[PDB]
Design a protein around this ligand. Structure first.
Ligand SMILES: [Mg+2]
Ligand SMILES: [Mg+2]
Ligand SMILES: [Mg+2]
Ligand SMILES: [Mg+2]
Ligand SMILES: [Mg+2]
Ligand SMILES: [Mg+2]
Ligand SMILES: [Mg+2]
Ligand SMILES: [Mg+2]
Ligand SMILES: [Mg+2]
Ligand SMILES: [Mg+2]
Ligand SMILES: [Zn+2]
Ligand SMILES: [Zn+2]
Lengths: 43, 177, 42, 162, 99, 71, 40, 38, 38, 124
RNA sequence: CACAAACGCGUCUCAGAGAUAAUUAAUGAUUUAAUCUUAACCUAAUUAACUCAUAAUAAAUCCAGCCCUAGAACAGGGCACA
């Protein structure tokens, strides 16, 4: 009934696919790892 | 532990009838365990190529409960094939007409879309009230617990519990209730 | 009133015969749980 | 608790107010320094629609509610009490607090549909004929956003729109 | 080509079958699959899911003992979490080093 | 446990002729068409009707005559 | 799974990583002479 | 390809959407509510 | 009635009521002020 | 008040003119009852659950061109073979004992009837 | 209309209950006034749909030949009156 105009992931109008909490916790885990890395690179 | 091959195999692949009450229960939480027992995904001997699968008898289908406003918001739709033959019936009207339709369509949609689907709904028995044939009743083995704990109203609470629950506030004496 | 054997069957008579087979097997010592044969050098 | 009695004795009307003995507050609250009645009894973020014994305390016999100036509650918790009383009333709890009209109980209708956790009213919701796909989905709300602040023993958030 | 690709997918399909069988035989004892797995690992018992499904099918008392061990480890971990202290160390919470 | 259900009753025995009575117990026979037989089998065995229909020559010829056996 | 718990307890993320299940030689002769070692 | 500044809100790359979501503002939440504190 | 997006009182006798899930400007002295949110 | 009667099986003879006292002309179709008998009675709970079923046969045909089970059940009933067999929905207070004949005086002059038949087949 | 039929230009028949969207009301709290209630409890006044009362079909194994207002073939109805 309702269509995405053109291709889903290219155009001016894209798919409204949201962010997920699993992706959120993955991002915070990666930030904590790189924060530890840039602590160990300090001195 | 020491059995012959044919009765050992018969005991391993024996079919079991389960009983399930549907009074004050959500159809999705009913259909989750109904789908599991219709698969035989509660069996450690489960295989998709085997004919393992158990019967489920659900009673009290008329006393089904929807969480939230799904009784009026949720629709069930079908098409008869002819032009102008699109029917969108509200779930309240569909349960008013055919009581077993809601649970039947929930289990029918939740079961995996293979060709075993029709065969395993052939092992499903749905009754609107507590009126089961005696041939079905003598087949039963155990009753599954209900997935939702039913809340009781004020009248089922005993007066011991009424005076056991402390009074939070003190109303003024000049007020009218 | 003590359980010595229990057997499956399609029919009650066949299950009773199989239970008798389980009881006879446990009495005689031929079980699935029995000691395997000793293949050793004495 | 004050009641009014209206008496008709031969073209003479007498209206009287009579005081009936009322129950009092329990003597030992666990948190005496709290102002607000719920927040001094430590029922904040604890109760739900299921707790009939507390929702029966702040209601009228005809199913109505009492004002916040009388109840003494904080405003957010008064709104939470109002939402939970409405949810229990549509859920079929408190059966004895309906008004009595003996002419109307006899003409039965279709049986009452069992329901719970109803944020809205049954008579004012349109059925979702159009629905939607996953990238725009019309979600049926179950429960209310006023009760998202309750404690989570599983740790997962309460899914309010499904 | 389908033979090679289904040979690649055979390990995944058999692993999914083993996880379904372990989930079935653990829910038969009233214990969930992830809790059962992590609490069996927390007792330093390293049995893979193939042989765990094998015990689940052919070995009911031994799988019941394993589920009892996992439930005991789960209750012990919950008790140690609610204790908020390092002094109580349980009988199954002790960690055995290599020798 | 519950006791064994005991069921044994012979209502076909006649006082006139036991040789006819024993034949009356062997006189039960019935023939029925394909479609009613399929729905009767489906109702009896709680399966769908599509299993009970037969199969083609090409399908019955590719079945293995000597399948492997374990144990 | 449970690699994180093994990381706090000091073991590898993988049970195959340097454990006593790994550097022991999995077979030996019945009379007791040692086996030839593993290429890995 | 759209310009840097448009009027149609310029729907973002998914990694940037994840960046926005992880770096949303969260308020300080006190332990006990100061209104029904003493 | 008039179907509108935002609602206001055109005189002091208009009142707000929430009926059928929607908001209503109802007015008794001037019935031409009857408005309904969309 | 809500009861229903037993219907008939007749033979469409032909058509005739008819006239009324106000001068208008109507057309009447001739329906002749030749042999009408109630055959068997199916109960309320075994047929539909609301109204019982009464079985009515039509005009009388030959013994030799009917089927064996049909002749056996009509031999038990007691009547010669009928042409067409129909089912009528009848309330329990209007039941008729099977083997009873019926006549056109079952219908009184001045009434409204419903007529069911196979129409003229025009083929493909 | 030169076939016993078909045909219209000719003739006959054509229906009850529930349900609603918008909109009016009755009782009554939050907000002891009021106020149709995405407050309950029972209420009514109410379009078109849409379902269901109700109607049709709804008796298994004689079928060679012949007829048929039944039919492409296969099917279907008659062949004791006379
Ligand atoms: Mg596009
Ligand atoms: Mg496209
Ligand atoms: Mg590999
Ligand atoms: Mg390598
Ligand atoms: Mg560019
Ligand atoms: Mg014709
Ligand atoms: Mg008032
Ligand atoms: Mg008024
Ligand atoms: Mg019908
Ligand atoms: Mg014929
Ligand atoms: Zn407070
Ligand atoms: Zn105005």
């Amino acid at each position: 009934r309702n269509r995405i105009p053109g291709r889903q992931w290219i155009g001016k109008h894209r798919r409204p696919r949201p962010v997920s909490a699993q992706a959120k916790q993955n991002m915070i885990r990666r930030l904590e790892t790189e924060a530890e890395n840039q602590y160990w690179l300090s001195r | 532990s020491s059995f012959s091959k044919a009765p050992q195999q018969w005991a391993t692949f024996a079919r079991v009838w389960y009983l399930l009450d549907g009074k004050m229960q959500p159809p999705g939480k009913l259909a989750a365990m109904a789908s599991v027992k219709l698969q035989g995904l509660h069996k450690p001997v489960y295989h998709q190529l085997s004919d393992c699968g158990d019967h489920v008898v659900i009673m009290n289908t008329r006393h089904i409960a929807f969480s939230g406003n799904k009784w009026e918001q949720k629709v069930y739709s079908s098409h008869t094939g002819y032009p102008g033959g699109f029917r969108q019936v509200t779930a309240a009207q569909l349960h008013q007409k055919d009581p077993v339709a809601i649970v039947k369509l929930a289990i029918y949609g939740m079961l995996p879309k293979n060709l075993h689907r029709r065969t395993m709904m052939q092992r499903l028995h749905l009754f609107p009230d507590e009126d089961i044939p005696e041939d079905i009743l003598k087949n039963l083995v155990e009753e599954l617990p209900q997935p939702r704990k039913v809340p009781r109203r004020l009248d089922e609470y005993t007066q011991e519990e009424i005076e056991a629950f402390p009074r939070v506030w003190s109303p003024p004496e000049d007020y009218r209730l | 009133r003590k359980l010595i054997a229990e057997g499956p069957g399609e029919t009650v008579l066949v299950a009773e015969e199989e239970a008798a087979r389980v009881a006879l097997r446990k009495l005689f010592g031929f079980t699935e749980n029995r000691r395997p044969w000793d293949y050793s050098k004495p | 608790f004050r009641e009014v009695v209206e008496i008709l004795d031969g073209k003479t009307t007498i209206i009287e107010g009579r005081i009936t003995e009322t129950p009092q507050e329990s003597p030992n609250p666990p948190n005496p320094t709290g102002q607000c009645p719920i927040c001094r009894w430590n029922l904040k973020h604890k109760y739900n629609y299921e707790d009939v014994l507390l929702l029966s305390q702040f209601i009228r016999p005809h199913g109505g509610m009492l004002p916040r100036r009388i109840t003494g509650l904080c405003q957010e918790e008064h709104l939470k009490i109002e939402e939970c009383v409405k949810m229990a009333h549509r859920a079929g709890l408190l059966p004895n607090h309906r008004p009595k009209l003996p002419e109307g109980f006899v003409p039965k209708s279709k049986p009452r549909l069992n329901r719970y956790l109803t944020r809205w009213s049954p008579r004012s919701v349109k059925p979702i004929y159009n629905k939607g796909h996953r990238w725009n989905k019309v979600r049926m709300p179950v429960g209310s956003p006023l009760l998202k602040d309750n404690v989570s023993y599983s740790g997962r958030p309460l899914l309010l729109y499904h | 080509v389908k033979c090679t690709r289904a040979r690649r997918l055979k390990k995944r399909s058999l692993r999914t079958l083993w996880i379904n069988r372990i989930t079935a035989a653990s829910q038969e004892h009233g214990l969930k699959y992830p809790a059962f797995i992590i609490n069996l690992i927390k007792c330093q018992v390293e049995l893979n899911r193939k042989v765990l499904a094998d015990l689940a099918i052919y070995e009911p008392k031994t799988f019941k003992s394993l589920a009892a061990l996992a439930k005991r480890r789960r209750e012990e971990g919950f008790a140690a979490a609610l204790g908020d202290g390092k002094e109580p160390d349980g009988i199954f919470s002790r960690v055995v080093q290599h020798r | 446990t519950k006791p064994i259900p005991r069921p044994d009753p012979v209502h076909n025995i006649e006082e006139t002729h036991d040789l006819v009575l024993k034949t009356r117990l062997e006189e039960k026979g019935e023939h029925l068409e394909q479609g009613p037989m399929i729905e009767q089998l489906s109702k009896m065995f709680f399966t769908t009707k599509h299993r009970w229909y037969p199969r083609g020559q090409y399908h019955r010829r590719r079945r293995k005559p000597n399948p492997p056996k374990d144990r | 799974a449970g690699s994180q718990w093994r990381l706090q307890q000091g073991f590898a993320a993988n049970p195959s990583g340097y454990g006593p299940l790994t550097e022991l030689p999995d077979w030996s002769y019945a009379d007791g002479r040692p086996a030839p070692p593993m290429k890995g | 390809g759209s310009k840097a500044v448009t009027r149609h809100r310029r729907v973002m790359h998914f990694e940037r959407q994840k960046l926005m979501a992880v770096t949303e503002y969260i308020p300080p939440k006190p332990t006990i509510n100061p209104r029904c504190l003493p | 009635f008039k179907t509108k997006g935002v609602l206001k009182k055109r005189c002091r006798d208009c009142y707000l009521v929430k009926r059928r899930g929607r908001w209503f400007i109802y007015c008794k002295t001037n019935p031409k002020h009857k408005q309904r949110q969309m | 008040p809500g009861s229903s009667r037993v219907g008939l099986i007749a033979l469409k003879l032909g058509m005739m003119p008819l006239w009324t006292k106000d001068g208008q002309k109507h057309v009447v179709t001739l329906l002749q009852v030749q042999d009408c008998h109630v055959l068997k009675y199916t109960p309320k709970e075994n047929h539909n659950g609301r109204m019982a079923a009464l079985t009515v046969g039509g005009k009388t045909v030959s013994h030799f061109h009917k089927s064996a089970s049909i002749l056996e059940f009509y031999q038990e009933l007691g009547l010669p073979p009928k042409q067409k067999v129909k089912i009528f929905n009848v309330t329990e207070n209007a039941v008729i004992k099977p083997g009873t004949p019926l006549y056109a005086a079952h219908f009184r002059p001045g009434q409204y009837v419903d007529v069911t038949a196979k129409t003229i087949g025009k083929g493909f």
